Amino acid sequence: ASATRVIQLLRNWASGRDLQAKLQLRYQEISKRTQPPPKLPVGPSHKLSNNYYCT
Amino acid sequence: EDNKQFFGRHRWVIYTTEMNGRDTFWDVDGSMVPPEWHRWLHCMTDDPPTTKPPTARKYIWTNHKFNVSGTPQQYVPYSTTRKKIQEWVPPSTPYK
Amino acid sequence: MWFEILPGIAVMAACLFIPGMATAHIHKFTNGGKEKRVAHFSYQWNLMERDRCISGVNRYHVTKGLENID
Amino acid sequence: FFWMFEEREKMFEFYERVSGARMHAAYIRPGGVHQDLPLGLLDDIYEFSKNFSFRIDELEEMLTNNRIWRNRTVDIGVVTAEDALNYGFSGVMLRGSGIQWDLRKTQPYDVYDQVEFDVPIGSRGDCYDRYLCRVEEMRQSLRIISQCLNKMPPGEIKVDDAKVSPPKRAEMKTSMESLIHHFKLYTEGYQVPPGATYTAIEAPKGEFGVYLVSDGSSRPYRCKIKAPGFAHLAGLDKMSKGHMLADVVAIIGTQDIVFGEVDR
Amino acid sequence: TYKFVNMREPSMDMKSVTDRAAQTLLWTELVRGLGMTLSYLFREPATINYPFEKGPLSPRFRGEHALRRYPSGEERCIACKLCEAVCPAQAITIEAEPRADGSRRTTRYDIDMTKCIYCGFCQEACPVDAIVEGPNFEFSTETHEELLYNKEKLLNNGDKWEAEIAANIQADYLYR
Amino acid sequence: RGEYVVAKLDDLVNWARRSSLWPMTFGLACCAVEMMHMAAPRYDMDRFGVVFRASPRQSDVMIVAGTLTNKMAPALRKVYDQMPEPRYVVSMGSCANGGGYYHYSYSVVRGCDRIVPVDIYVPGCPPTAEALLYGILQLQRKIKREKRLRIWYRR
Amino acid sequence: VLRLVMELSGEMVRKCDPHIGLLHRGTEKLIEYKTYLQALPYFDRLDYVSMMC
Amino acid sequence: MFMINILSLIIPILLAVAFLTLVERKVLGYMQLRKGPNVVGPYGLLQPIADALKLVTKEPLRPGTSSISMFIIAPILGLSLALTMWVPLPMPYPLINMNLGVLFMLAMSSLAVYSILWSGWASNSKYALIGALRAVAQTISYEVTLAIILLSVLLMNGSYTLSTLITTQEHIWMIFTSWPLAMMWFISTLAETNRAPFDLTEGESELVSGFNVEYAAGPFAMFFMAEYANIIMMNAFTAILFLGASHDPHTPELYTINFVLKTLALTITFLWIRASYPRFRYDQLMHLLWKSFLPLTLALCMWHISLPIMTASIPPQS
């Protein structure tokens, strides 16, 4: 779906930890969904010579 | 859209009060999202159709249709093939 | 977003609220503004009966002071 | 349930982003995975892995030291270490009792050998020890995730040999050999040399195996499924021999028996 | 390597026994969980407002099958029947024919959605990217016959979800 | 005339039914796990008045979640036959809708419809949680368009 | 899906008898009619909590 | 206007029970990261109305293998006792000043067994017949602890007049004197109302529901009404018994507000406990009270009867 500091200190003390370091939420830190076109690499046997399938 | 919210509540839709006859004011489903905005809704992209004009072409529909199941505009399956072995037409001249 | 629960119990509070003053007010309403005279022992009942008899209106919570007597 | 199921949904998002469906990927095919990951997937995995331990321990604190979670579960239905392995038990069922055995280390398939990790080994062989083993397996899983995330090499996704894996779409539409190979691969498929194998891996339930015997054609001859839950349910009678009904339902929990693989 | 999970036996000094007796009598771990759940009560609720807001997806999402067509408007399907030979559930059926123009299009092309298992094998099998799976998942129907698609229904699906499929393919063809 | 009063009354009744349908879970395969994800925090079925947990005696809708085998069929039949009216049964997943991956099996019925009436056909393998939820919403709109007392008054 | 025909002197369970087959699909019969490439998704739908495993 | 006061007691308790079925589904969900019902009206305020209408117009199935007499009487007993057991509560001016109000209400608290047994047996199902005896044993075995706790607490109050209990507390919260006792009492309350940590009757693996299995629609909803009315009633009992409040006779509303706030807090603690804890096992369930709770309760009662004597602080009888 951040909160008030009064509630922020209440949940942390009840949870006994500093949860603001990482919440179960996920804010703007996520990876962008419009990544540039990736140029994928090739495999080992991509040469045009000495690629005899027999060997 | 609100860029501050969580990734999944950062964008939303207020649906139309009316779409192709039906008055969808008080009740509405997720089927009146036109495809151009469908990708933007489901985070398939970060580009709204206003900023990202879909490539227009002749055969694309000019009016989105929600799921027409239930209403008499629903789809019914039917064989889309021609006829198999065809019957022999009897003659019309008399027996003699 | 705990405040969404706040309407939910609020009416609930009101739901438990009403039996509070309703019994409290009606007593005050019935007993001439005074609260109900609880009779937990027979002496209290005798006092209430003598008050009812002295009132002359068959209403115990009606009370008359020295102005009633000589 | 719900607290960790939100994270499970976050996993389903990755599943969707790699293969195309959030549950049934059809990703890992013979000759390597189907296609490469989308850009930015690694970063999101990194953030999730950072955030996960703070809720793994959170689940622990609710269950581990709780009085009634232990009392309902501690030392109910003991399984003897000797009697465990004869019963065909596997996975955490073995590790809960105390045998130091794990296919990820002893018989390392793929690159599991280069990955450093400890296994949780049980103490009393009871329900509670197995549950703790599952949680410590969560944490060691997070450590393994970090290790593989940091050291993924540059290379292709499928075996370069096109006769077993479909060619890339570029050479499909430009090269004769790729077109014919794809046509036959999706028409006939890679004919497998005749032979029988029993391949076993450390599935999270337990050791999961396939007895695949192929006659020597485009089709298999017989595949048999060793599911970790079958021998488990076979031994489930000896598993509970005097404990209450609430105990048998506490048993089928760390028995972790999904009825999709035992039943086949 | 391995780690023993539960061998941490307790000590027996006066302090440790007093602490354990207090924890057993004055319920503490009980209160620990009772306070953790409180922390989760005051947190931000994870909930997406359907259908106003939809779940995040990916360009590879596998959904309703559809038959695309070339920019000229001609359908891409040349009826090679590769997709029929690929579908593990055999949900695809084609009958081909030499058309009036000549191009070998399908007289019949039906996908049994109730037999389909939504794998994406057909699209990766297609050598002309004719059959594809659109991003739509909002086609829950009322009658079983409604699910059994036809060639015309597939063409209409490809003509409704078309900007979607074109944009997704443009963002995914490099991966595949 | 009577249509006004009877329509308002039955509109009230069908709204009450629509916003308080109680699923009878009934998960047979991976469709069960996807439904469980659909009741997870993210989509939160319980928000819409649906309660997911329901004994078959107190329930309104059955979700046939997964493949239905021959050995199962009598049990599902006895479960539905005991289900109090109204009882709308939704079939989720290609397997439950008809056949499935294991369409041509020997111990799997080729569709829940051959066993029990299906009110909403939900496709997917598995139907992604929100698709299930949309099927539930479609059933809700179906309950909205319910004219029981209208037909009684106009029989 | 599950069936436990249990025999119990009240509480301590004497002898259980699980009845698997309540979700029986002929997958092991189904494999040897499709190619391996077509046989893959069966395993995906086999243990549906550990798909990729 | 006496009957008007009665109705002003029943009806608001009915709305309170109705909206408890909403506040629980909201509190639980928020405790487990769920927004809860907020679609039926604003913030789900209208949701209890819809489910109530559905259950009223749901078909009530007659159990074919049953005698209808008890199938109808058991909801009557469970519901009517639950409501009439609200009668002697010290609102600032309690409705009925029964000289033995606490004993009156404790005696009526035992009557829920007399709905449980007929529901479990008359419906004539395995789950019903099991759960009837199991739940009966639960509630009867915790009623004793409730009894000694009530007696030991009252030994400092003065009498069984439940209106004077306020006069007992006045200065300090009574829990400050009997926090070891209340900690048991509250938990035993949790046991008597059959709540998730101590329910044991639902047990949705081997008992499913236990008593409300074959009950459908209306008679089924009546037992829920009894169950979620006992929640409020016993939380209110505990609230006055231990969490005292001020009461100025010239301003009755003050104690009313304080008391309803205490009741809401305690009910929220009920929901709080159920949303977190696992469920007991019958073995441990009766082990908890027979082995552990009862000896401590006996010793505490001995302590609390000896204490007023040695301190020369016996409470006033009248």
Ligand code: SF4
């Ligand atoms: S996803 Fe397409 S190719 Fe695969 S089984 Fe379903 S219809 Fe056939």
Ligand code: SF4
């Ligand atoms: S694989 Fe593509 S071109 Fe070949 S028949 Fe199928 S849809 Fe047509």
Ligand code: SF4
């Ligand atoms: S339709 Fe797909 S997800 Fe559902 S049970 Fe069948 S194989 Fe599993």
